[PDB]
């Protein structure tokens with residue numbers, strides 16, 4: 001997250017870190033959301049490589065012991081049948097991960113609330129991006145969870161030539177575009193938490209930013225619109 005502020009410990013308990021076995025260490029690669037005690041929702045872009053994956057819940061500092069962490073293997077990976085690595089503009093950037101164990105819920109570990117199917121936010125809706133990704137374009141990862149306030153930009157504006165134009169689809173959400181805050185590398189897969197009816201729900205899965213850089217004016221951060229995939233999610237879980 002560029003232009004973030006450090007997240008309080010217990011504010012975003014459905015945020016996870018998706019890590020891969022890097023040599024003999026484990027590296028943060030992505031974010032995700034816990035949606036079931038044994039299911040994680042992240043971006044399909046995060047699993048394009050055939051890596052050994054793990055999920056960390058109750059994580060606040062990647063490099064220190066918080067005293068709250070649960071570390072769980074991934075048992076199964078389900079990418080969206082229409083995902084294609086070479087065409088991220090097409091959308092379908094979503095994956096579900098079945099965990100090798102069910103985690104224990106607590107104040108640091110909760111399920112992500114999903115929107116109702118087909119829900120679309122009003123322009124300039126109040127949302128937060130969270131993640132441990134680059135705090136600058138070509139920077140380094142954050143050690144602590146970061147948050148940024150990132151209003152939505154409706155499809156009408158977002159698909160205008162000045163913004164993203166045709167690269168964005170109605171199956172996406174755009175948020176931000178101020179040139180100061182954004183998501184950035186290592187945030188994708190993660191949540192966009194939007195306040196609706198006085199409850200935070202997860203409306204986006206962080207997908208991409210400009211090639212030009214992370215925090216680019218009139219280049220919002222782009223998300224998979226979760227409320228487009230609700231049947232899909234429920235079908236996979238039912239059947240796995």
Ligand SMILES: *C(=O)c1cc(NC(=N)N)ccc1[C@H](Cl)C(=O)OCC
Pocket residue numbers: 029030043044045046047048049183184185186187188189206207208209221
């Ligand atoms: C985000 O999901 C993502 C994932 C990957 N690959 C893995 N981290 N293993 C590459 C790129 C991205 C996107 Cl494009 C990204 O970083 O978007 C920044 C918001």
Ligand SMILES: [Ca+2]
Pocket residue numbers: 059060061062063064065066067069
């Ligand atoms: Ca930690």
